[PDB]
Amino acid sequence: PQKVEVDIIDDNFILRVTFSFDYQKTGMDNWIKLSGCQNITSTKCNFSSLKLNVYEEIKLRIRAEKENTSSWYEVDSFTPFRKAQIGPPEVHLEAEDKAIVIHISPGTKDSVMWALDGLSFTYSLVIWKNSSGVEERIENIYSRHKIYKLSPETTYCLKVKAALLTSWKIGVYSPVHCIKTTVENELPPPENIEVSVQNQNYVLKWDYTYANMTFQVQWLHAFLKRNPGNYKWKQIPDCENVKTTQCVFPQNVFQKGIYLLRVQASDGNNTSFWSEEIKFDTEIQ
Amino acid sequence: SCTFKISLRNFRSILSWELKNHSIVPTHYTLLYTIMSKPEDLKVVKNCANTTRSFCDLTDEWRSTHEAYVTVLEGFSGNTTLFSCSHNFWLAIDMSFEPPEFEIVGFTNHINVMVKFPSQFDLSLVIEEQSEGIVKKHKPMSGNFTYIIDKLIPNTNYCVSVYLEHSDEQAVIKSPLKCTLLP
Amino acid sequence: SLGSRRTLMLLAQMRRISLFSCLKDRHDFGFPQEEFETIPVLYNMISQIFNLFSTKDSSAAWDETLLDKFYTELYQQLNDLEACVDSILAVRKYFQRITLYLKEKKYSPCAWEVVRAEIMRSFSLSTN
Ligand SMILES: *[C@@H]1O[C@H](CO)[C@@H](O)[C@H](O)[C@H]1NC(C)=O
């Protein structure tokens, strides 16, 4: 039996005849067959709910049968996890005048391999203009994320790979995806946002460059940007539809913790896109 | 039911309890404990079984600040057991550190502070030196321990307190002030 | 630092029921404490707690306000570790043990308490 050398992505196996599939854990006695991987065509067998944990250090046996004879291909006992490479992540886009939004999740969502490690992904990507091909490389992003400072009616392209700062392990790239930012926002966004405290209550102000705009202000827990699956910006009530370039509200409004903020301009007909975002400790003194 | 207070007094951990709304009150009490991290049987704590007094010295029993302790206190009067309360404790959070006994002696330019220790935690010692409204923290432990506050001056009243500090966030329990002028 | 003290309190506050009534369901998970320079094991350790208490299953078990304050502490903890920049395999297997325990227990209320109290030990161990 001459041994075989196999790599892994997510919940799959990849070889590099028709085939069959066995393993015996280090501490081996018996030999069990993973369902659906016996007498199969392809060189990749998927095992979600097939194999209980990928954290053991196993040994594999492969039955390769060409015509009337079946060869024996062993596999040097490995640990699945140590070998596993992150599958291509899933990418979802939403377009703007000057900006793009990214929603991302592991390909093979609910992957048995990933299990828990998933809420912990760092993503990194490279994006560029469609024709210019100027690639701004951006590493260390979070599961869902927004990109600013772009030109309207313009097609940008990109591919994303996942990474886990955790195990040195880093992943394969998504397919490239492109979109063309919409025509420039008629009402531009409020722009430089700053927050302060006075006595006990709270106040923030922005620059909307037009007179007679209202502004619907929203907040988000800061940590929720790392949690891609299933997420709601809540609006700040004292500030809902205010008539001026600042609005206020008291200390007790935010419990201690870490939040995200954004601001919007509207003339009541065509509203504007959102301002850029910001975070704060809920602690100062 | 019953309220449980856990304190550490001069290097020993004293678990104590008080009862809320009990008409028939117990004569003899028995306290038991185990931890959550392993399925071990409740051990009765030796010295605290069928004691009259409401407090138990658990110093030799509860070594680690890294366990969730579950206690059950039973009380009897009669051919009768009357009831048994349970409660849980995390030493690093629920504990309270009582201040050491101490003395001071004023000398010409300095003070001898003798902290009486007898002969398990990450605790820090702070000897406070307070005078003219001004407080200094000193952070310099078996048997009697002496600490000298030096660079002191004649004819100036100084007031001193000592306490043990686990974490800054958790509250600190200070000794009473003891005060003297230098000779 | 301040995060551990203020984190354990949150875990401590989250308790929904008597530990005495859950004693039956206790179980030794064999946390690999010798693992506790070390940063890579810690980031691994936490990222698991976050991603563990973030399940739809965890959300049904605990107070949302506490859970939240909790995520917030760990969120800041991960950035701190992110910044600076086998053991994990063992730390990961451990969480495999935990995940399995809850399943078998059908996430019973007591089964959740057995785990909460266990994480407080795991965490406190790794912090000192
Ligand atoms: C984008 O440019 C690429 C080459 O970079 C080309 O293949 C593609 O057809 C272009 N798309 C559009 C809509 O211009």
Coordinates of C-alpha atoms and ligand atoms in Angstrom, one line a residue:
Chain A
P1 CA 0.0 0.0 0.0
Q2 CA 1.7 3.2 -1.3
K3 CA 0.6 6.3 0.7
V4 CA -1.4 9.3 -0.5
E5 CA -0.9 13.1 0.1
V6 CA -4.1 15.0 0.6
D7 CA -5.0 18.7 1.3
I8 CA -8.1 20.3 3.0
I9 CA -10.5 23.2 2.5
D10 CA -13.3 23.6 5.0
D11 CA -15.4 20.4 5.1
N12 CA -13.7 18.9 2.1
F13 CA -10.9 16.5 1.1
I14 CA -8.8 16.9 -2.0
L15 CA -6.6 14.3 -3.8
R16 CA -3.4 15.4 -5.5
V17 CA -10.2 4.9 -11.2
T18 CA -13.0 5.3 -8.7
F19 CA -12.6 5.7 -5.0
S20 CA -13.6 4.7 -1.4
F21 CA -13.0 6.4 2.0
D22 CA -11.7 5.2 5.4
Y23 CA -10.0 6.4 8.6
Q24 CA -8.4 5.0 11.8
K25 CA -7.5 7.5 14.6
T26 CA -4.1 7.4 16.1
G27 CA -4.9 4.8 18.7
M28 CA -6.3 2.9 15.8
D29 CA -7.9 -0.5 16.0
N30 CA -11.1 -0.5 13.9
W31 CA -11.7 1.0 10.5
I32 CA -14.8 3.0 9.7
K33 CA -16.2 4.4 6.4
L34 CA -17.4 8.0 6.1
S35 CA -20.7 7.9 4.4
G36 CA -21.1 9.0 0.7
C37 CA -17.3 8.6 0.1
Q38 CA -17.4 5.0 -1.0
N39 CA -17.3 4.2 -4.7
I40 CA -17.3 7.9 -5.6
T41 CA -16.3 9.8 -8.7
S42 CA -14.7 13.1 -7.5
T43 CA -11.4 13.7 -5.7
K44 CA -13.2 15.8 -3.0
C45 CA -15.3 14.3 -0.2
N46 CA -17.4 16.6 2.0
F47 CA -18.0 15.6 5.6
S48 CA -20.2 17.9 7.6
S49 CA -22.1 15.7 10.1
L50 CA -20.0 12.9 8.7
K51 CA -17.0 13.4 11.0
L52 CA -17.6 14.5 14.6
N53 CA -14.6 16.6 15.3
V54 CA -11.6 17.6 13.1
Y55 CA -9.5 18.1 16.2
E56 CA -8.1 14.5 16.4
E57 CA -5.0 13.3 14.6
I58 CA -6.2 10.6 12.3
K59 CA -5.0 8.1 9.7
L60 CA -6.7 7.6 6.3
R61 CA -7.1 4.7 3.9
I62 CA -8.2 5.3 0.2
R63 CA -9.5 2.5 -2.0
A64 CA -8.8 3.3 -5.6
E65 CA -10.3 0.8 -8.0
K66 CA -9.3 0.9 -11.7
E67 CA -11.0 -1.9 -13.7
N68 CA -10.9 -5.2 -11.7
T69 CA -8.1 -4.2 -9.2
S70 CA -8.2 -1.9 -6.1
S71 CA -5.0 -0.2 -4.9
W72 CA -4.2 0.8 -1.3
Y73 CA -3.4 4.5 -0.5
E74 CA -2.5 5.2 3.2
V75 CA -2.2 8.7 4.6
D76 CA 0.4 9.9 7.1
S77 CA -1.5 10.5 10.4
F78 CA -2.3 14.2 10.4
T79 CA -4.6 16.5 12.3
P80 CA -7.4 17.8 10.0
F81 CA -7.4 21.2 11.7
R82 CA -3.7 21.7 11.3
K83 CA -4.0 21.0 7.6
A84 CA -7.3 22.7 6.9
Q85 CA -7.3 25.8 4.8
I86 CA -10.0 28.4 5.0
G87 CA -12.5 28.2 2.2
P88 CA -13.3 31.2 0.0
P89 CA -15.5 33.6 1.8
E90 CA -18.9 34.7 0.7
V91 CA -19.2 38.3 -0.5
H92 CA -22.2 40.7 -0.7
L93 CA -22.2 44.3 -1.9
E94 CA -24.3 47.4 -1.6
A95 CA -23.5 50.4 -3.8
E96 CA -23.3 54.2 -3.3
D97 CA -22.4 57.5 -4.9
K98 CA -19.0 57.7 -3.1
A99 CA -18.9 54.4 -1.2
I100 CA -19.3 50.6 -1.0
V101 CA -20.7 48.1 1.6
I102 CA -19.4 44.6 2.3
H103 CA -21.2 41.8 4.0
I104 CA -19.0 38.6 4.4
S105 CA -19.3 35.0 5.6
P106 CA -17.3 31.8 5.3
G107 CA -18.1 29.8 2.2
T108 CA -19.4 26.5 3.5
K109 CA -21.5 28.3 6.2
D110 CA -22.0 26.1 9.3
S111 CA -18.8 24.3 8.4
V112 CA -17.9 21.5 10.9
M113 CA -14.3 22.4 10.5
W114 CA -14.8 26.0 11.5
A115 CA -17.3 25.3 14.3
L116 CA -16.5 28.2 16.7
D117 CA -13.5 29.7 15.0
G118 CA -15.8 31.5 12.6
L119 CA -16.9 34.5 14.7
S120 CA -13.2 35.2 14.9
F121 CA -12.3 35.7 11.2
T122 CA -10.2 38.5 10.0
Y123 CA -10.7 39.2 6.3
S124 CA -8.3 40.9 4.0
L125 CA -8.8 42.1 0.4
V126 CA -7.6 43.9 -2.6
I127 CA -9.9 46.2 -4.6
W128 CA -9.4 48.4 -7.6
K129 CA -11.1 50.5 -10.3
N130 CA -12.5 48.5 -13.3
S131 CA -10.3 50.0 -16.0
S132 CA -7.6 51.7 -13.9
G133 CA -6.8 48.6 -12.0
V134 CA -5.3 50.6 -9.2
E135 CA -5.4 48.1 -6.4
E136 CA -5.7 49.4 -2.9
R137 CA -4.8 46.4 -0.7
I138 CA -6.7 46.2 2.6
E139 CA -5.9 43.6 5.2
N140 CA -7.5 43.0 8.6
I141 CA -11.1 43.8 7.9
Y142 CA -14.1 42.6 9.9
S143 CA -16.9 40.4 8.8
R144 CA -18.9 43.3 7.4
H145 CA -17.4 46.6 6.4
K146 CA -17.8 49.9 4.4
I147 CA -15.4 51.6 1.9
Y148 CA -15.5 55.4 1.3
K149 CA -13.8 58.0 -0.9
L150 CA -14.9 56.7 -4.3
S151 CA -16.2 58.3 -7.5
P152 CA -19.8 57.7 -8.7
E153 CA -21.0 55.8 -11.7
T154 CA -17.7 53.8 -11.4
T155 CA -17.1 50.1 -11.5
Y156 CA -14.9 48.7 -8.8
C157 CA -13.8 45.1 -8.6
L158 CA -12.4 42.9 -5.8
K159 CA -11.7 39.5 -4.3
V160 CA -11.6 38.6 -0.7
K161 CA -9.7 36.0 1.2
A162 CA -10.3 35.0 4.8
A163 CA -7.8 34.7 7.5
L164 CA -7.5 33.8 11.1
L165 CA -5.1 35.7 13.1
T166 CA -5.6 32.7 15.5
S167 CA -3.9 29.7 13.9
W168 CA -1.3 31.0 11.5
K169 CA -3.8 29.6 9.0
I170 CA -5.0 31.8 6.1
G171 CA -7.5 31.2 3.3
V172 CA -8.3 31.0 -0.4
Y173 CA -9.7 34.0 -2.3
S174 CA -13.3 34.5 -3.3
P175 CA -14.2 35.0 -6.9
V176 CA -13.8 38.6 -8.1
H177 CA -16.9 40.7 -7.8
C178 CA -17.7 44.0 -9.4
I179 CA -20.3 46.8 -9.0
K180 CA -20.7 50.4 -10.3
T181 CA -21.3 53.0 -7.7
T182 CA -24.5 55.0 -8.3
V183 CA -24.7 58.5 -9.5
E184 CA -23.5 61.0 -6.9
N185 CA -25.8 61.7 -3.9
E186 CA -27.7 64.9 -4.4
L187 CA -27.6 65.7 -0.8
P188 CA -24.0 64.9 0.3
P189 CA -23.4 63.5 3.8
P190 CA -22.9 65.3 7.0
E191 CA -19.1 65.0 7.3
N192 CA -16.9 65.6 10.4
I193 CA -18.5 64.1 13.5
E194 CA -17.4 64.9 17.0
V195 CA -18.8 64.1 20.4
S196 CA -18.6 65.8 23.9
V197 CA -20.1 65.9 27.4
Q198 CA -21.4 69.0 29.3
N199 CA -22.6 68.5 32.8
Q200 CA -24.2 65.1 32.7
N201 CA -25.9 65.1 29.2
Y202 CA -24.3 64.5 25.8
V203 CA -24.0 66.4 22.6
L204 CA -22.5 66.0 19.0
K205 CA -22.4 68.2 15.9
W206 CA -21.7 67.7 12.2
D207 CA -21.3 69.8 9.1
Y208 CA -24.1 69.6 6.6
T209 CA -23.3 72.2 4.1
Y210 CA -26.9 73.1 3.2
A211 CA -29.5 75.0 5.1
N212 CA -32.8 73.5 6.2
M213 CA -31.9 69.9 6.5
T214 CA -33.1 67.4 9.1
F215 CA -30.9 64.6 10.4
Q216 CA -31.9 61.1 11.6
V217 CA -29.1 59.9 13.9
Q218 CA -28.3 56.2 14.5
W219 CA -26.0 54.1 16.8
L220 CA -24.6 50.6 16.8
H221 CA -22.8 48.5 19.4
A222 CA -19.2 48.6 18.2
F223 CA -18.6 44.9 18.6
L224 CA -21.4 43.8 16.3
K225 CA -19.4 44.7 13.2
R226 CA -17.5 41.4 13.7
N227 CA -20.7 39.3 13.7
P228 CA -21.6 38.8 10.1
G229 CA -24.6 36.4 10.3
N230 CA -28.2 37.5 10.9
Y231 CA -28.0 43.3 13.3
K232 CA -29.9 46.5 13.7
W233 CA -28.8 50.2 14.0
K234 CA -31.0 51.8 16.6
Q235 CA -31.9 55.5 16.2
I236 CA -31.2 58.1 18.9
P237 CA -34.6 59.4 19.8
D238 CA -33.9 63.0 21.0
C239 CA -32.2 63.3 17.7
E240 CA -34.8 61.8 15.5
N241 CA -35.4 64.3 12.8
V242 CA -33.8 67.3 14.5
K243 CA -33.9 70.7 12.8
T244 CA -30.3 71.8 13.5
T245 CA -26.6 70.7 13.1
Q246 CA -26.4 69.2 16.6
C247 CA -28.7 67.4 19.1
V248 CA -28.4 66.4 22.7
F249 CA -29.3 63.7 25.2
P250 CA -28.3 62.7 28.8
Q251 CA -25.6 60.4 30.3
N252 CA -27.9 57.5 31.2
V253 CA -28.8 57.0 27.5
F254 CA -25.9 54.7 26.9
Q255 CA -24.9 52.1 29.5
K256 CA -21.1 51.9 29.8
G257 CA -19.7 50.1 26.8
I258 CA -18.5 50.8 23.3
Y259 CA -20.7 52.1 20.4
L260 CA -20.7 53.2 16.7
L261 CA -22.3 56.3 15.3
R262 CA -23.7 57.6 11.9
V263 CA -25.7 60.7 10.7
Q264 CA -28.0 61.4 7.7
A265 CA -29.3 64.5 5.9
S266 CA -32.7 64.7 4.2
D267 CA -34.8 67.4 2.7
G268 CA -37.9 65.2 3.0
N269 CA -37.9 64.1 -0.6
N270 CA -34.5 62.9 -1.6
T271 CA -32.7 61.9 1.6
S272 CA -28.9 61.7 1.7
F273 CA -26.5 58.8 2.2
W274 CA -25.0 58.3 5.7
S275 CA -22.0 60.1 7.2
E276 CA -18.8 58.2 8.0
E277 CA -18.8 56.3 11.3
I278 CA -17.2 56.8 14.8
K279 CA -16.7 55.1 18.1
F280 CA -16.3 56.0 21.7
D281 CA -15.7 54.4 25.2
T282 CA -18.6 55.8 27.1
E283 CA -15.9 56.7 29.5
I284 CA -14.3 60.1 29.8
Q285 CA -13.1 62.4 32.7
Chain B
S1 CA -33.7 32.4 53.9
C2 CA -30.1 33.2 54.8
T3 CA -27.5 35.8 53.9
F4 CA -23.9 34.7 53.6
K5 CA -20.9 37.0 54.2
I6 CA -17.4 35.9 53.5
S7 CA -14.5 37.8 55.0
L8 CA -10.8 37.2 55.5
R9 CA -9.6 38.2 59.0
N10 CA -5.9 38.3 59.9
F11 CA -5.1 35.6 57.4
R12 CA -8.1 33.3 57.8
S13 CA -11.2 33.1 55.7
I14 CA -14.4 33.3 57.8
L15 CA -17.6 32.3 56.3
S16 CA -20.6 33.6 58.3
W17 CA -24.3 33.7 57.9
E18 CA -27.5 35.5 59.0
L19 CA -31.1 34.3 58.8
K20 CA -34.0 36.3 57.3
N21 CA -37.5 35.6 58.7
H22 CA -37.1 32.4 60.9
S23 CA -39.4 31.8 63.8
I24 CA -38.0 28.5 64.9
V25 CA -34.2 29.1 65.0
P26 CA -31.6 26.3 64.8
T27 CA -29.5 25.3 67.8
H28 CA -26.7 23.3 65.9
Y29 CA -25.7 24.1 62.3
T30 CA -23.7 22.1 59.8
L31 CA -22.0 23.6 56.7
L32 CA -21.0 21.6 53.6
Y33 CA -19.3 22.4 50.3
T34 CA -18.1 21.2 46.9
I35 CA -17.0 22.8 43.7
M36 CA -18.6 22.8 40.3
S37 CA -15.6 21.9 38.1
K38 CA -15.7 18.3 39.2
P39 CA -18.7 16.1 40.3
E40 CA -17.3 15.6 43.8
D41 CA -19.4 14.8 46.8
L42 CA -20.3 17.5 49.3
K43 CA -17.7 17.3 52.1
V44 CA -18.8 18.4 55.5
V45 CA -16.3 20.8 56.8
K46 CA -14.8 19.3 59.9
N47 CA -14.8 22.2 62.4
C48 CA -18.1 23.7 61.3
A49 CA -20.4 20.6 61.7
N50 CA -23.0 20.9 64.5
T51 CA -21.4 24.1 65.9
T52 CA -23.5 26.5 67.8
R53 CA -21.8 29.6 66.4
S54 CA -22.7 31.2 63.2
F55 CA -19.4 31.4 61.5
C56 CA -17.0 29.0 59.9
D57 CA -13.2 29.1 59.5
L58 CA -12.7 27.7 55.9
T59 CA -9.1 28.7 55.5
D60 CA -7.8 25.2 55.1
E61 CA -10.6 24.1 52.9
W62 CA -10.9 26.8 50.2
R63 CA -7.4 27.2 48.7
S64 CA -8.1 28.4 45.1
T65 CA -9.7 31.6 44.0
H66 CA -10.4 29.8 40.8
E67 CA -13.3 27.6 41.8
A68 CA -17.0 28.1 42.0
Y69 CA -17.8 27.0 45.6
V70 CA -21.3 25.7 46.4
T71 CA -22.2 25.6 50.1
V72 CA -25.2 24.2 52.0
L73 CA -26.0 25.2 55.5
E74 CA -28.2 23.0 57.6
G75 CA -29.7 23.8 61.0
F76 CA -31.3 21.6 63.6
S77 CA -33.3 21.8 66.7
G78 CA -34.6 18.5 67.8
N79 CA -35.0 15.0 66.5
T80 CA -35.6 17.7 63.8
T81 CA -33.5 19.1 60.9
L82 CA -35.1 22.5 60.2
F83 CA -33.8 23.6 56.8
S84 CA -30.8 24.0 54.6
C85 CA -29.8 27.0 52.5
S86 CA -27.5 26.9 49.6
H87 CA -25.3 29.7 48.1
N88 CA -22.4 30.2 45.8
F89 CA -19.1 31.9 46.2
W90 CA -16.3 33.2 43.9
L91 CA -13.4 34.1 46.1
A92 CA -11.9 36.7 43.9
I93 CA -15.2 38.6 43.8
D94 CA -17.1 37.8 47.0
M95 CA -14.2 37.9 49.5
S96 CA -13.5 41.0 51.6
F97 CA -10.1 41.6 53.1
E98 CA -9.9 42.7 56.7
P99 CA -7.0 45.1 57.7
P100 CA -4.1 43.8 59.8
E101 CA -3.5 44.8 63.4
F102 CA -0.9 47.5 63.6
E103 CA 1.1 49.8 65.8
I104 CA 3.2 53.0 65.2
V105 CA 6.0 54.5 67.1
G106 CA 7.1 58.1 66.4
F107 CA 10.8 58.8 66.4
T108 CA 12.6 62.0 65.6
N109 CA 12.5 62.1 61.7
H110 CA 10.5 58.8 61.2
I111 CA 7.8 56.3 62.2
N112 CA 8.0 52.5 62.9
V113 CA 5.0 50.8 61.7
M114 CA 4.8 47.2 62.9
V115 CA 2.2 45.2 61.2
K116 CA 1.3 42.1 63.0
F117 CA 1.0 39.1 60.8
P118 CA 0.7 35.6 62.1
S119 CA 3.2 32.9 61.3
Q120 CA -3.1 32.3 49.3
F121 CA -4.0 35.4 47.3
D122 CA -2.6 37.9 44.9
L123 CA -3.2 40.8 47.4
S124 CA -1.2 44.0 47.8
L125 CA -0.3 45.8 51.0
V126 CA -0.8 49.6 51.2
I127 CA 0.4 51.5 54.3
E128 CA -1.2 54.9 54.0
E129 CA 0.7 57.9 55.4
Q130 CA -1.6 60.8 55.9
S131 CA -0.7 64.3 57.1
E132 CA -1.9 67.9 56.7
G133 CA -4.7 66.5 54.6
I134 CA -2.2 64.8 52.3
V135 CA -2.2 61.0 51.7
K136 CA 0.7 58.8 50.5
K137 CA 0.4 55.1 49.5
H138 CA 3.3 52.9 50.5
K139 CA 3.6 49.4 48.9
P140 CA 6.6 47.6 50.5
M141 CA 4.3 38.0 54.6
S142 CA 4.7 36.0 57.8
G143 CA 5.2 36.9 61.4
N144 CA 5.6 40.5 62.5
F145 CA 6.5 42.9 59.7
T146 CA 8.0 46.3 60.3
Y147 CA 7.8 49.2 57.8
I148 CA 9.4 52.6 58.4
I149 CA 8.0 55.8 57.1
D150 CA 11.0 58.0 56.8
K151 CA 11.7 61.6 55.8
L152 CA 9.3 62.7 58.5
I153 CA 9.6 65.9 60.4
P154 CA 9.4 67.1 64.0
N155 CA 6.3 69.0 65.2
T156 CA 3.8 67.8 62.6
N157 CA 0.9 65.5 63.3
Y158 CA 0.8 62.5 60.9
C159 CA -2.2 60.0 60.7
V160 CA -1.8 56.4 59.5
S161 CA -4.0 53.7 58.0
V162 CA -3.2 50.3 56.5
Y163 CA -5.3 48.0 54.3
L164 CA -5.2 45.1 51.9
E165 CA -5.8 45.7 48.2
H166 CA -6.8 42.8 45.9
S167 CA -7.8 44.8 42.9
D168 CA -8.3 48.5 42.8
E169 CA -11.9 48.2 41.5
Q170 CA -13.0 46.0 44.4
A171 CA -13.5 48.1 47.6
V172 CA -10.8 48.4 50.3
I173 CA -11.3 48.0 54.0
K174 CA -9.1 50.4 56.0
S175 CA -7.9 50.1 59.6
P176 CA -8.8 53.0 62.0
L177 CA -6.3 55.9 62.1
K178 CA -3.5 55.9 64.6
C179 CA -1.7 59.3 65.0
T180 CA 1.5 60.8 66.6
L181 CA 3.9 63.7 66.4
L182 CA 7.6 63.1 66.1
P183 CA 9.8 63.5 69.2
Chain C
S1 CA -6.3 43.8 33.8
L2 CA -9.4 45.7 34.6
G3 CA -11.1 43.6 31.9
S4 CA -10.8 40.3 33.8
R5 CA -12.1 41.7 37.1
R6 CA -15.0 43.4 35.2
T7 CA -15.5 40.3 33.0
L8 CA -15.9 37.8 35.7
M9 CA -18.4 39.9 37.5
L10 CA -20.5 39.8 34.4
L11 CA -20.3 36.1 34.2
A12 CA -21.0 36.0 37.9
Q13 CA -24.1 38.3 37.4
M14 CA -25.5 36.2 34.5
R15 CA -26.5 33.3 36.8
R16 CA -30.1 32.3 36.3
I17 CA -30.5 29.6 39.0
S18 CA -29.2 27.8 42.1
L19 CA -25.9 26.0 41.7
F20 CA -27.1 23.5 44.2
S21 CA -29.9 22.3 42.0
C22 CA -27.4 21.7 39.1
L23 CA -24.8 19.7 41.0
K24 CA -26.1 16.5 39.2
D25 CA -25.0 17.8 35.8
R26 CA -21.4 18.7 36.9
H27 CA -18.7 17.2 34.7
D28 CA -14.9 17.4 34.5
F29 CA -13.9 19.1 31.2
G30 CA -10.1 18.8 31.9
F31 CA -9.1 22.4 31.0
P32 CA -5.4 22.4 29.9
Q33 CA -4.2 25.0 32.4
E34 CA -0.4 24.3 32.0
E35 CA -0.7 26.3 28.9
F36 CA -1.1 29.1 31.3
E37 CA 5.1 34.9 25.0
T38 CA 1.8 33.1 25.6
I39 CA -0.4 35.5 23.6
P40 CA -1.2 33.1 20.8
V41 CA -2.9 30.7 23.2
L42 CA -4.9 33.6 24.8
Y43 CA -6.3 35.0 21.6
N44 CA -7.3 31.5 20.7
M45 CA -8.9 31.0 24.1
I46 CA -11.0 34.2 24.0
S47 CA -12.0 34.0 20.3
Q48 CA -13.7 30.8 21.4
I49 CA -15.6 32.3 24.3
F50 CA -16.8 35.2 22.1
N51 CA -17.9 32.9 19.3
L52 CA -19.4 30.5 21.9
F53 CA -21.6 32.9 23.8
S54 CA -22.7 34.4 20.5
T55 CA -24.8 31.4 19.4
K56 CA -28.5 31.6 18.9
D57 CA -28.4 29.0 21.7
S58 CA -26.4 31.2 24.1
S59 CA -28.8 34.1 23.4
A60 CA -31.8 32.2 24.7
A61 CA -30.0 31.3 27.9
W62 CA -28.7 34.7 29.2
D63 CA -29.8 38.2 29.9
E64 CA -29.2 40.3 26.8
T65 CA -27.9 43.3 28.7
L66 CA -25.4 41.2 30.5
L67 CA -24.4 39.2 27.5
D68 CA -23.9 42.5 25.7
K69 CA -21.7 44.1 28.4
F70 CA -19.8 40.8 28.1
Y71 CA -19.1 40.9 24.4
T72 CA -18.0 44.5 24.9
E73 CA -15.3 43.4 27.4
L74 CA -14.0 40.6 25.2
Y75 CA -14.3 42.8 22.1
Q76 CA -11.8 45.2 23.6
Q77 CA -9.7 42.3 24.9
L78 CA -9.4 40.8 21.4
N79 CA -8.2 44.1 19.8
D80 CA -5.6 44.4 22.5
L81 CA -4.3 41.0 21.6
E82 CA -4.8 41.5 17.9
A83 CA -2.5 44.6 18.2
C84 CA 0.5 42.9 19.8
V85 CA 1.8 41.5 16.5
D86 CA -0.6 22.5 19.2
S87 CA -1.5 24.4 22.4
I88 CA -4.4 26.0 20.6
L89 CA -5.2 22.6 19.1
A90 CA -5.5 21.4 22.7
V91 CA -7.5 24.6 23.7
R92 CA -9.7 24.1 20.6
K93 CA -10.3 20.4 21.5
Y94 CA -11.4 21.5 24.9
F95 CA -14.1 23.7 23.4
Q96 CA -15.1 20.6 21.4
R97 CA -15.6 18.9 24.7
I98 CA -17.8 21.7 25.9
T99 CA -19.8 22.0 22.7
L100 CA -20.5 18.3 22.9
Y101 CA -21.6 18.4 26.6
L102 CA -24.3 21.0 25.9
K103 CA -25.6 19.1 22.9
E104 CA -26.0 15.9 24.9
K105 CA -27.6 17.9 27.7
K106 CA -30.0 19.5 25.2
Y107 CA -28.8 22.8 26.6
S108 CA -30.8 22.2 29.8
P109 CA -30.9 25.2 32.2
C110 CA -28.6 23.2 34.6
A111 CA -26.3 22.2 31.8
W112 CA -25.9 25.9 31.0
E113 CA -24.9 26.7 34.6
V114 CA -22.5 23.8 34.7
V115 CA -20.7 25.5 31.7
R116 CA -21.0 29.1 32.9
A117 CA -19.3 28.3 36.2
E118 CA -16.7 26.3 34.3
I119 CA -15.8 29.1 32.0
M120 CA -15.2 31.4 35.1
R121 CA -12.6 28.9 36.3
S122 CA -11.0 28.6 32.8
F123 CA -10.8 32.3 32.4
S124 CA -9.6 33.1 35.9
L125 CA -6.9 30.5 35.5
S126 CA -5.7 31.9 32.3
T127 CA -5.6 35.4 33.8
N128 CA -3.3 34.8 36.7
Ligands
LIG1 C1 -14.2 45.6 -16.6 O1 -12.9 45.5 -17.0 C2 -12.5 44.2 -17.3 C3 -11.0 44.1 -17.5 O2 -10.4 44.7 -16.4 C4 -13.4 43.6 -18.4 O3 -13.1 42.2 -18.5 C5 -14.8 43.8 -18.2 O4 -15.6 43.5 -19.3 C6 -15.1 45.3 -17.8 N1 -16.5 45.5 -17.4 C7 -17.2 46.6 -17.8 C8 -18.7 46.6 -17.6 O5 -16.6 47.6 -18.3

